Amino acid sequence: DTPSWNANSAVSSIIYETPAPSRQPRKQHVLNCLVQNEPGVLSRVSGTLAARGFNIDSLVVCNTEVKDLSRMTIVLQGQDGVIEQARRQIEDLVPVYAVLDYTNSEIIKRELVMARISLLGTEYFEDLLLHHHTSTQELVAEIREKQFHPANLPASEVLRLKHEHLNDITNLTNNFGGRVVDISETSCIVELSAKPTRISAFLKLVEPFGVLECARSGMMALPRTPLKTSTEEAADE
Amino acid sequence: IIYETPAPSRQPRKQHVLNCLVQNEPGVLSRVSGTLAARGFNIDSLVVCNTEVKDLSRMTIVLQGQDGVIEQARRQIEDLVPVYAVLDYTNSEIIKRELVMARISLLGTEYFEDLLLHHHTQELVAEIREKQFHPANLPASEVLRLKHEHLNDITNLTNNFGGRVVDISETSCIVELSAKPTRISAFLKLVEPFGVLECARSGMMALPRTPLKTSTEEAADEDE
Amino acid sequence: NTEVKDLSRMTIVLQGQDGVIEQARRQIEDLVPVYAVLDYTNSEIIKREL
Amino acid sequence: LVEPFGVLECARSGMMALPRTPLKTSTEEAADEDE
Amino acid sequence: DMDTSFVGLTGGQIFNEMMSRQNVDTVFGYPGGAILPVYDAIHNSDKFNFVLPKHEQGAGHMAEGYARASGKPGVVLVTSGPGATNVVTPMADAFADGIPMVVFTGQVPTSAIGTDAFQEADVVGISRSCTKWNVMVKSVEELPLRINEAFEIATSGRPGPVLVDLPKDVTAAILRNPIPTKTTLPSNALNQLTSRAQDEFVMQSINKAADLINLAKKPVLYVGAGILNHADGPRLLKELSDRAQIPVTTTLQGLGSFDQEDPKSLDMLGMHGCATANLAVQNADLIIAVGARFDDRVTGNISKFAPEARRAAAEGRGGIIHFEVSPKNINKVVQTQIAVEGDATTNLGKMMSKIFPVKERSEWFAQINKWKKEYPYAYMEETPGSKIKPQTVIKKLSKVANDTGRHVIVTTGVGQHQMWAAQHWTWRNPHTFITSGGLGTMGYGLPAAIGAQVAKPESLVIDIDGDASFNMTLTELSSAVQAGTPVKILILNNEEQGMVTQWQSLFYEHRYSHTHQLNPDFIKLAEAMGLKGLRVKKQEELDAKLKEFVSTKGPVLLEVEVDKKVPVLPMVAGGSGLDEFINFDPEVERQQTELRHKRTGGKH
Amino acid sequence: DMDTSFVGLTGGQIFNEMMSRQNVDTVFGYPGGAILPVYDAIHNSDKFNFVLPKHEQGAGHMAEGYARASGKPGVVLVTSGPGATNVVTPMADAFADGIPMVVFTGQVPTSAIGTDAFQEADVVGISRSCTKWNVMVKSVEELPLRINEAFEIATSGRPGPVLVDLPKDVTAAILRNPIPTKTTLPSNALNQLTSRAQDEFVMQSINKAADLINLAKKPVLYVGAGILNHADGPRLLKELSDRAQIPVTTTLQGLGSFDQEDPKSLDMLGMHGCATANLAVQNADLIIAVGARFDDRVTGNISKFAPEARRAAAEGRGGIIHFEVSPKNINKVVQTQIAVEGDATTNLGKMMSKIFPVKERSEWFAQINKWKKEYPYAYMEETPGSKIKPQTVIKKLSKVANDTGRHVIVTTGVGQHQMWAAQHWTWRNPHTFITSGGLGTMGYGLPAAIGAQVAKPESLVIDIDGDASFNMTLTELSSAVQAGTPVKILILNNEEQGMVTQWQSLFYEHRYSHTHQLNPDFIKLAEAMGLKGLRVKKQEELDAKLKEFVSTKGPVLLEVEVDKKVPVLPMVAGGSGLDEFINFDPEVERQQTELRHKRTGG
Ligand SMILES: Cc1cc2nc3c(=O)[nH]c(=O)nc-3n(C[C@H](O)[C@H](O)[C@H](O)COP(=O)(O)OP(=O)(O)OC[C@H]3O[C@@H](n4cnc5c(N)ncnc54)[C@H](O)[C@@H]3O)c2cc1C
Ligand SMILES: Cc1cc2nc3c(=O)[nH]c(=O)nc-3n(C[C@H](O)[C@H](O)[C@H](O)COP(=O)(O)OP(=O)(O)OC[C@H]3O[C@@H](n4cnc5c(N)ncnc54)[C@H](O)[C@@H]3O)c2cc1C
Ligand SMILES: Nc1ncnc2c1ncn2[C@@H]1O[C@H](COP(=O)(O)OP(=O)(O)OP(=O)(O)O)[C@@H](O)[C@H]1O
Ligand SMILES: Nc1ncnc2c1ncn2[C@@H]1O[C@H](COP(=O)(O)OP(=O)(O)OP(=O)(O)O)[C@@H](O)[C@H]1O
Ligand SMILES: COC(=O)c1ccccc1CS(=O)(=O)NC(=O)Nc1nc(OC)cc(OC)n1
Ligand SMILES: COC(=O)c1ccccc1CS(=O)(=O)NC(=O)Nc1nc(OC)cc(OC)n1
Ligand SMILES: Cc1ncc(C[n+]2csc(CCOP(=O)(O)OP(=O)(O)O)c2C)c(N)n1
Ligand SMILES: Cc1ncc(C[n+]2csc(CCOP(=O)(O)OP(=O)(O)O)c2C)c(N)n1
Ligand SMILES: [Mg+2]
Ligand SMILES: [Mg+2]
Ligand SMILES: [Mg+2]
Ligand SMILES: [Mg+2]
DSSP states (O other): OOOOOOOOHHHHHHHHHOOOOSSSSOOOOOEEEEEEOTHHHHHHHHHHHHTTOOOOOOOOOEEEEETTTTEEEEEEOHHHHHHHHHHHHHHHHEEEEEEEOOOTEEEOOOOOEEEEEEHHHHHHHHHHHTTTTOEEEEOHHHTSSSOOGGGGSSSSSHHHHHHHHHHHHHHHHHHHTOEEEEEEESEEEEEEEEEEHHHHHHHHHHHOOOEEEEEEEOOEEEEEEOOOOTTTOOOOO | OOTTTTTSSOOOOOOOEEEEEEOOOSHHHHHHHHHHHHTTOOBBOOOOOHHHHOEEEEEEEEEESSSHHHHHHHHHTTSSTTTEEEEOOOOOOOEEEEEEOOOOOOOOOHHHHHHHHHHOOHHHHHHHTTTTTTTTSOOOHHHHHHHHHHHHHHHHHHTTTTTTEEOOSSSSEEEEEOEEEEEEEEOOHSGGGGGGOOOOOOOOOOOOOOOOOOOOSSSSSOOO | OOTTOOOOOOOOOOOOOOHHHHHHHHHHTTTOOOOOOOOOSSSOOOEEOO | OOOGGOOOOOOBBBOOEEOOOOOTTTTTOOOOOOO | OOOOOOOOOHHHHHHHHHHTTTTOOOEEOOOOSSTTTHHSSSSHHHHHSSESSSSSHHHHHHHHHHHTTTOOEEEEEOOOHHHHHSSHHHHHHHHHHHEEEEEEEOOOTTTTTTTTTTTTHHHHHHTTTSSEEEEEOTTTTTHHHHHHHHHHHHTTSOOOOEEEEHHHHHHHHBSSOOOOOOOTTTHHHHHGGOOHHHHHHHHHHHHHHHHHHHHHHHEEEEEGGGGGGTTTTHHHHHHHHHHHHHOOEEOSSSSSOOOOSSSEEEEOTTTSHHHHHHHHHHHHHHEESSOOOHHHHHOGGGGGGHHHHHHHHHTOOOOEEESSGGGGGGTSSSSSSSSESSSSSHHHHTGGGGOOOOOOOOOOHHHHHHHHHOOOOOOOOOTTBBOHHHHHHHHHHHHHTTTTTTTEEEOOOOHHHHHHHHSSSSSOSSTTTOOSSSSSOOOOOHHHHHHHHHHHEEEEEEEEEEEEEEEESSGGGHHHHHOOOOEEEEEEEEOOOOHHHHHHSSSTOOOOOOOOOOOOHHHHHHHEEEEOOEEEEEEHHHOOOOHHHHHHHSSSEEEEEEOOOOOOSSSTTOOTTTTTOOOOHHHHHHHHHHHHHHHHHHOO | OOSSSSTTHHHHHHHHHHHHHHHHOOOEOOOOOOOTTHHHTTTTTTOOEEEEOOOOOOOOHHHHHHHHTTSSOEEEEEOOOHHHHHHHHHHHHHHHTTTOOOEEEEOOTTTTTTTHHHHHHOOOHHTTTTEEEEEOSSTTTHHHHHHHHHHHHSSSSOOOOEEEEEHHHHHEEEEEOBBOOOOOOOOHHHHHHTHHHHHHHHHHHHHHHHHHHTOSSSSEEEEEEGGSTTTTHHHHHHHHHHHTOOOOOEOOGGGTOTTTTTTTTEEOOOOOOHHHHHHHHHTOOOEEEEEOOHHHHHOOTTTTHHHHHHHHHHHHHHHEEEEEESGGGSSSHHHSSEESSSOHHHHHHHHHHHSOOSSSOHHHHHHHHHHHHHOOOOOOOOOOTOOOOHHHHHHHHHHHOOOOOOOOOOOOOOOOHHHHHHHHHOOOOOSOEEEOOOOOTTOOHHHHHHHHHHHHHSEEEEEEOHHHHHTTTTGTTTTTTTTTTTOOEEEOOOSHHHHHHHHHHHHHOOOOOOOOOOOOOHHHHHHHOEEEEEEEEETHHHHHHHHHHOOEEEEOEEEOOOSOHHHHHHHOOOOOOSSSOOOOHHHHHHHHHHHHHHOOOO
């Protein structure tokens, strides 16, 4: 027999689950520099930002299949007056054509993550993470004593758990628009490209399985186009 | 077969569908709803739909009752001055769709019984948390797998019904589905044991199929 | 219509300043047959339309 | 995008919503620099 | 499309001009703050004759009476807030009886709307249920258009009330742009352009209706107020009554549409209707419903309404034919075999050619004559020693009204006096009876009389009120004098709420609870209001003072003390059908007279 | 939990018992067909009294006065159709001024609803926008529940009108099974879970409220009718004005909450409020709103309202503190700096003693008392060779009625007489002023005066009404002599619509469009209604008639012929601020008098 929500208890759960403001009024600023590919352009764009104390999150130099032309998607935080200041500093550099502002534009943000995830369960990962920690103590026996730890399971199991975990990770990866590119005897490698916040969500959901290696890189950006219907385009004045 | 085959019940009931073409003047929504409520009609849903046309709305009213009773409702609404016409889709091949978004827990029945009783504001609390497959008294690894096991079972249901999982958290997974109300309720009943946290059903949107069913009986009907 | 007896959910979209819209929230929430009117602006939500 | 083909008849709903919780990695949420 | 006539004019100046362009010569209303810019423009206008009541409810009812008498829409111009909430009852009354009137209410400035401002009310949201259609003019640009839309709807199909909410900033601002004065109504105007599927469709129903009339053996013409909404209405009704020789029965609001001293007249049917008409309906094989909506007060028990007509429909020998202008009222209470949508008068005129001429009906037309003798309008007649009684009062008043030679217009309140004035008065001319049937509002008589007098100054307007109906809108006597209306106010004083006391004597064992208000002195009241007030107390003082009350030149009041707890008979109540009525019996009333004294303790 | 004490009783019989369960001792209303099963049960009832009018509008207004006088919800029991639609206006009045009342209207049987039945009206839909809550009782099982819900909502938070439809088939049916009795309000579900969060919110805001109080250099206690919704309301009001030494101004509906005999009183502000109060608000650095909603008749112009308080807000010197019971009225007109949600009385009691007592504010009270000296209620006082001035009539009656040693309750209509009755009359003791402000309904004077004496039979009720307003409900005269209410009726007859003619003279060039109604002979009207009628033409006759009326045993009428075209002053209208008022001047009043005749000729 499955119980049902009460008319009152339902409302109580909603307002209790409704999250408090967990974000600043400021937003994710995105600047896209158009630079000339001269020897040392990377070192001076970074140097200009680092020497003036700007909280940058990524840089990412992108080729554009045009000779001697590159573009950098810079992501930073701060006030509008600070970002515009940071923008004008970079643009003043002579190998820089222009620095576009995407902080208020419909863009497509893309990070690329590659991570090897263990299939041997949480117990083994907890053991492995403790083993490599001891460098430069009775827990090693406490972990290897837990249930569902490989050493405490038959050979038919674990094999059945590895593929069960593999199915879970694959289903997580598929739903996020990713793919499993490698399947090891004890692990697997996933590949995912989406929004930076969507990557963070994926790397949190797949975290309990155990992330052996990881490579997140940075965010790339390309402007979308806000298309509206002919009755919403006629909504002028 | 004799034992399982479905059966009716006392005092039957059938569904009627109306489609209103109204002018988007100030009010309207309060006018049609008020007129139908001031006459004690059944009214299962209203759902105001926007046509991509300037100053033209569209409503899909779901009713039940005798054919002469709901006909009174049709003429009652059409008389209203911003209503262009009210069409009856109850005797025509139409496409009725309803949007539903549920949160649905991943922690199972035992935790769901705990969560409901917690917000319902003893001894039965202890017995629930002493069940075998509650998150408590159960290894963190098996909870992790049971989360994704439920996540898969829910995913397979949404897939079969032509839906999709749009969000996945550490304890729940928001699903989306657009289908017939008779199918929406079927899905909500199947995923019910997993424990539905939040839910929201749009109502019913109706659009008639472009008149086409048979190829050989088009002119070989000989009904005349 | 949620899957709870005698409980419905209404989603409203407004335009204007925060001071005007917040008043609209407090004006609806004060009504008798309502439990609480939540503000989903400045919040991560899944907007849907059919 | 479908408009050029010619929309003969359209039914577009209002707007419903369901709150989402923005997940962040344990390394990202560990950044509690509220000094 | 556009118009360059209202350029430079304010919202008030436009309203003043729009009234003359809608052919309006009489405006009822009460001034106020949010309606000031409008009243400033109608100040000493040469277009319409303004009437100032003492209460807004009076202004609305006077507009109803003006519409019931003249036919032209009754315009109401009041203020915002309380001034708009007082015209609710007149609107709901006109919405129930289908009376064409346009109500203009003031409103706070658009900037103040939604701030719980001074004298602010959701007038649109309130009148939404009791008006045909309401609208708030958002700008001066829409003002000439909204008014035209209001007057059209108020007179289209079945006439009704419309509300036009006028904000201050809208009626004060100056229009400086050319604007449209005509837009198509999305519901009927452009939809009716598909006329071929309607004009030729109704023609099929017309032909099938006429064939059923010629096939009818016992046809009853069911006539309502719908036939009065046309000039050639009553004429085509009489013509049909001579072509097929069918008897004609009318409702409370259908009185005056047909001659009652005609052998083909079944008088009024319904709850307190004659047994002749009721038994004619129950035994008819075909009922031609013309301009009626089959009210609960008429049909009685719907499960018992016209059993013979329903049987004839099953045998394909007869049934029910309905002439409605509003399809919403078709198949609402009774199942109609063949309906003829559109104007009743228009549809009757295009059916005469398809109806076979009848010389004389024998069997059934002689049976209804037996019912006229066995079951006529009966009541306890007067005896030496007993005080006056209402039945004989209306009887004599109807005789001294014809003796004048004037055009007699009669309005009533709501109660027992309303029923007696409806059945015992001989109605022969259209638009002569003006009463509240659908909503049944008390205090409707006096102001409706005033409004009717404005429409027809050279007509004898008589108000047959009760002591409870009157003394509700009591203050409007000062308006009858101010407007200079020679109305005739008659009060059947039984010192009680008679209609309710009857229900308490029949269905609640003579247990009268708060059914007796404290009446003032009506002849000292009249003197204070500024008009002479007469009073009849003795039985032999009736006839000699009944001519003085009518021959009086100007506003006059007459209080006639009558008998108490006299039930209106016949009566059809409970689960009883039209053939299960309760007629008059001198022995029963004699027992009820003693039983009442016993249960009440001699109090009444 | 369910009850079982109504088993066997009809719906009407249940209604009768619910009156005693809800402590109702008076029920107004008017019988009818669809409400018959209810009246058959309350026949000679031993639970309550029944005041029977002759118009449903009267019964509604009688319930308002009955509520404002005592503090109990006014009960109205009328029929369906037109009987219910006549109760719309008093419900709109009760919705604006916030008057607690429960209106029971009849209805056609449920099997006839939606068939355009006899005397059927969508009362639920009509009265939806002018009631806090309404419901149509579908079954006799719901009737004991819906009544308890109606009365609770009508008394919870800000008091207001609620309507309950009673179909005939529901009141005639017999209850044969147990029913739930206690209410099911969704507002309680939220406030229970969010109790501590709200409890901490209001306390932490009170601390901040008491902080800016101690920073105020020239504070003003801005009080409304919200303080009158509690017994210890005015009691805690004066004890805050005494402690922190704060001058007190009040709104029209809040009048009586502060005895203006107190040296700290500024009395009424607003459009027709004294210039002393309007200037005090404008020059204030901290305004403490106690139970007021900042009406447009109060603020004059939002753009320039309390400029010094808005200055002190940006400087952190003061601002505006708002004590409010319903969060809907916070920041809907003007923006406050501190919000204290809840009952103003109970909130002040918790903010009390966290405030620093003051000895004396020398400079602030000096300019205030100087403002009284140069800006009092100045008007054209009558000369021996002139007609009676209306303003002095109130001021005369003010002392005459008060020196009788009785409890005096004053009720007015709507117009110039309404303002003049609030300006000159000294308001000692609370709940003594009952008028219509939010909606401003004419004909509100007489019925409310009648119902107010039903609640307070020992008290002396006085109706200061105008001729145009009295003409709307003069019908309810013989109801006062039937209910046994010795009401005192005063008619300041100016033979015109003064409040409208005033606006027409200032903004419409003296064009009086249909503002002169033909008043009947009031003295003979009263005699016709079985009531003692009195008049006064000359000035010397007034002093004898006023003492004759207030001492008259039983219902009495008083008609005073006053001057023509007398504008209420000072006036704050148009796009002017409260400091930009139109002051009185006998010379510009003379010019306005002479130039009026030239544009009229009569
Ligand atoms: C105390 C009391 C007792 C009453 N008892 C009775 C009684 O016993 N008998 C009785 O007859 N009445 C009685 N009445 C009145 C009763 O309540 C209804 O009002 C009455 O039935 C109204 O008459 P009606 O339906 O024919 O006209 P309406 O109510 O005005 O209906 C008019 C119908 O005709 C249609 N129509 C309108 N105009 C046109 C047109 N131009 N062309 C075609 N169709 C049109 C309309 O769509 C509408 O459906 C009583 C009233 C009161 C107050
Ligand atoms: C012709 C005319 C002229 C007028 N001119 C003026 C004028 O010049 N000056 C003037 O002041 N008025 C004037 N008025 C009246 C004006 O229209 C308003 O009705 C008046 O301002 C009422 O203000 P109020 O806040 O005191 O009363 P209300 O309108 O009843 O204010 C209600 C407020 O009180 C609060 N409240 C109620 N109970 C509590 C509680 N227990 N705890 C906390 N808060 C509570 C409510 O939440 C609400 O915010 C005039 C009226 C008329 C008819
Ligand atoms: N917890 C999560 N956080 C972020 N993204 C998620 C999460 N779970 C799943 N996703 C991904 O989000 C995708 C939803 O795609 P969707 O079409 O709804 O984007 P959207 O409509 O633009 O909404 P949004 O603006 O929030 O991204 C899922 O298919 C899934 O790939
Ligand atoms: N352990 C594995 N060894 C080899 N191939 C694997 C393994 N696991 C999965 N694969 C398969 O290899 C595929 C990935 O091949 P991919 O599309 O990346 O071609 P690629 O870019 O040329 O890589 P590579 O250079 O290694 O051949 C997986 O989708 C999967 O089908
Ligand atoms: C009627 O006023 C409003 O509708 C209103 C409401 C909110 C805000 C503004 C207005 C318009 S107003 O302030 O300028 N008042 C007005 O035009 N006329 C006006 N006439 C009076 O006497 C009949 C009395 C009076 O209020 C005391 N107001
Ligand atoms: C008020 O009537 C109803 O509520 C009603 C309306 C539609 C259908 C049925 C009814 C109930 S009823 O037919 O039985 N009438 C009734 O209860 N009271 C009743 N009282 C009258 O005198 C005051 C007069 C009168 O109509 C002539 N009806
Ligand atoms: C406004 C209103 N209130 C109540 C009713 C119910 N009602 C109908 S008749 C009546 C009594 C009136 O009787 P009366 O007017 O004196 O005429 P009488 O029955 O005496 O002939 C009442 C209270 C109504 N129709 N309208
Ligand atoms: C029901 C209603 N109608 C109209 C108004 C507009 N109005 C406000 S005061 C007034 C004139 C009232 O004059 P009166 O009652 O005689 O007061 P007096 O002139 O004697 O001061 C009017 C018509 C209103 N407030 N309410
Ligand atoms: Mg997306
Ligand atoms: Mg299918
Ligand atoms: Mg009577
Ligand atoms: Mg006056």
